[PDB]
């Protein structure tokens, strides 16, 4: 519970994590009694393949925090769904790959996220191109 | 038992022993009690290697020589790591299961296995 959570959370995290909170509650509910009905239903199978991955990307190592731009990027790439075709064993290696790739290659996303304090769509487009590049680099 | 405290491959060896033991624990009323209808190939490898490890873990003590007839040996850290590294990755499956029982190091288990095979040709 957070009484005043929405007030201090910036709009980038809001517009990127409302859907994540929705689908996380949905994955937690699809977790139990999962087998007998939703065995190959497309909605529930996709929500499971992107909700096991939700908890996968929600993991972390101790004493390795991620600043705000990394959080918005890692949650945007989980909310869009560019990892459902990937391996569950190799989510996090691709995660640190995309993290360090935006950390070195792309210097505009950090500036836009810091300045606007929201999810500006030009940063979204350049981020999308970088995500597609890392997608190809890891699938191949 | 933390990966970034004692060694990542050490932690992976320990975690894989725990995983194989969690396999054998639930598989007991599956294959070992009633069904046994060729459970799998990959399940049979885990069951056989789990019984191998369960022979392998217990070892002859120093103070139990006069107690229950066991000569005394000492086993180190990297030695146990390499022993379970060999046993988990499926290399010494051909040796008998009781070649790993009541033994120290993994090379001592392989030596006892060859002694029991020289008994098997007898």
């Amino acid at each position: 519970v957070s009484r005043v959570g929405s007030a201090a959370q910036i709009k980038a995290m809001k517009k990127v994590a409302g859907k994540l909170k929705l689908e996380l509650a949905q994955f937690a509910e699809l977790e139990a009694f999962a087998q007998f009905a939703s065995d190959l239903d497309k909605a529930t199978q996709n929500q499971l393949a992107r909700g096991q991955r939700l908890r996968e990307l929600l993991k972390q190592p101790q004493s390795a925090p991620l600043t705000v731009e990394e959080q918005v990027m890692t949650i945007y790439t989980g909310t869009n769904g560019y990892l459902d075709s990937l391996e569950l064993d190799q989510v996090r290696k691709y995660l640190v790959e995309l993290r360090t790739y935006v950390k070195t290659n792309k210097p505009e996303f950090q500036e836009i996220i810091s300045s606007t304090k929201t999810f500006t769509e030009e940063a979204e487009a350049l981020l999308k191109e970088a995500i597609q590049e890392q997608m190809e680099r890891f699938l191949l | 038992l933390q990966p970034r405290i004692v060694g990542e491959e050490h932690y992976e060896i320990a975690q894989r022993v725990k995983e194989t033991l969690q396999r054998y624990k639930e598989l007991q009323d599956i294959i070992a009690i009633l069904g046994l209808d060729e459970l799998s190939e990959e399940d049979r490898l885990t069951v056989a290697r789990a019984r191998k490890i369960e022979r392998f873990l217990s070892q002859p003590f120093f103070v139990a020589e006069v107690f229950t007839g066991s000569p005394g040996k000492y086993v180190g850290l990297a030695e146990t790591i390499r022993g379970f590294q060999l046993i988990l990755s499926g290399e010494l499956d051909s040796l008998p299961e009781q070649a790993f029982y009541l033994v120290g190091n993994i090379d001592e288990a392989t030596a006892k296995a060859m002694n029991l095979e020289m008994e098997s040709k007898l």
């Binding site: 959370q9 995290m13 909170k21 | -």
Partner: protein, 73 residues
């Protein structure tokens, strides 16, 4: 905001300047790790961290002090 450097906390259960966040959990479950992550995430801001360790083990507090010193905290 005052982001704890966690994905789940700073994502869906935010914590602001002046919002008490009780970290309630059992023994050996990761709450001290949560607090240390929160503290180490304040590397740049004007966040003067204060931390009290009531009745904790000497090895625990010394290890966390060493972690703080190595992390530049």
């Amino acid at each position: 905001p005052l982001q704890t450097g966690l994905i789940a906390i700073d994502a869906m259960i935010p914590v602001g300047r002046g919002q008490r966040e009780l970290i309630i959990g059992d023994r050996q479950t990761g709450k001290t790790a949560v607090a240390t992550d929160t503290i180490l995430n304040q590397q740049g801001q004007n966040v003067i961290c204060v931390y009290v360790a009531i009745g904790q083990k000497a090895s625990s507090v010394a290890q966390v002090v060493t972690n703080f010193q190595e992390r530049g905290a």
